[PDB]
Design an enzyme around this catalytic site. Sequence first.
Site, mmCIF file in Angstrom:
data_model
loop_
_atom_site.group_PDB
_atom_site.id
_atom_site.type_symbol
_atom_site.label_atom_id
_atom_site.label_comp_id
_atom_site.label_asym_id
_atom_site.label_seq_id
_atom_site.Cartn_x
_atom_site.Cartn_y
_atom_site.Cartn_z
ATOM 1 N N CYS A 130 0.814 -1.192 0.000
ATOM 2 C CA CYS A 130 0.000 0.000 0.000
ATOM 3 C C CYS A 130 0.854 1.249 0.000
ATOM 4 O O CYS A 130 1.672 1.452 0.882
ATOM 5 C CB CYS A 130 -0.925 0.045 1.214
ATOM 6 S SG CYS A 130 -2.454 0.927 0.778
ATOM 7 N N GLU A 174 -8.612 -1.970 -4.864
ATOM 8 C CA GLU A 174 -9.072 -0.596 -5.112
ATOM 9 C C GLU A 174 -10.481 -0.289 -4.604
ATOM 10 O O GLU A 174 -10.678 0.742 -3.959
ATOM 11 C CB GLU A 174 -8.908 -0.199 -6.591
ATOM 12 C CG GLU A 174 -7.449 -0.250 -7.117
ATOM 13 C CD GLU A 174 -6.421 0.347 -6.158
ATOM 14 O OE1 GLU A 174 -6.716 1.379 -5.509
ATOM 15 O OE2 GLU A 174 -5.301 -0.232 -6.064
ATOM 16 N N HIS A 177 -10.588 0.505 -0.947
ATOM 17 C CA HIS A 177 -10.244 1.897 -0.628
ATOM 18 C C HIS A 177 -11.440 2.835 -0.644
ATOM 19 O O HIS A 177 -11.538 3.728 0.209
ATOM 20 C CB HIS A 177 -9.172 2.463 -1.568
ATOM 21 C CG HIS A 177 -7.781 2.072 -1.207
ATOM 22 N ND1 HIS A 177 -7.264 2.244 0.064
ATOM 23 C CD2 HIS A 177 -6.782 1.560 -1.958
ATOM 24 C CE1 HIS A 177 -6.013 1.822 0.081
ATOM 25 N NE2 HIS A 177 -5.697 1.402 -1.131
HETATM 26 ZN ZN LIG Z 1 -4.032 0.450 -1.955
#
Ligand SMILES: [Zn+2]
EC number: 3.5.1.88
Length: 203
Positions: A130, A174, A177
Amino acid sequence: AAIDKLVKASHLIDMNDIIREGNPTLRKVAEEVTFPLSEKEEILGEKMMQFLKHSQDPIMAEKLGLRGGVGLAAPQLDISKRIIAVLVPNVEDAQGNPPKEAYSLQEVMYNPKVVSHSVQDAALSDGEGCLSVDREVPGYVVRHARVTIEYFDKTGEKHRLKLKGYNSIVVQHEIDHIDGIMFYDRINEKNPFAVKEGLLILE
Ligand SMILES: [Zn+2]
Ligand SMILES: [Zn+2]
Ligand SMILES: [Zn+2]
Ligand SMILES: [Zn+2]
Ligand SMILES: [Zn+2]
Ligand SMILES: [Zn+2]
Ligand SMILES: [Zn+2]
Ligand SMILES: [Zn+2]
Ligand SMILES: [Zn+2]
């Protein structure tokens, strides 16, 4: 506001635009975008794709101080909107020939979501990283093996797509997130390397 800095014509996204673990924006549920898109939202998408492109070109990456990457979500730029970019290259063969298609996945996705998935789970053998996390975090990040996603492109056109393997892992990471979920939320708490029978370990 972050959005103004990021969308300036001459601005290139780099590591310094990425917010850090602990920043509350990373744990919010990001807001749905409405269509037609604002200029800021369209430009943000383009800058995000360009970031991945730059990240994957060794010399541009050296110039901008970027590590190679295949995904980026708006909340990582401090923008709480449901916008992700994905860029997964195909690899050269053993003789050094470029692939027939440069990318197995290349999209800026607005309002993406998982609409169905496999019962089977999968995880990358080498774990996950990350841009926002400056710690070593070992273990299997356990996700859905296969997913069906919907999303909208910058024009407002809806797409429906089945994904498996590595591309499945990428889009899931993704989408997480934009829901305020971090990769390590999906690592086993007692044994980071626990394997439930039938888990696909992806090489
Ligand atoms: Zn990420
Ligand atoms: Zn910047
Ligand atoms: Zn709302
Ligand atoms: Zn444009
Ligand atoms: Zn460029
Ligand atoms: Zn649907
Ligand atoms: Zn389900
Ligand atoms: Zn799920
Ligand atoms: Zn934990």
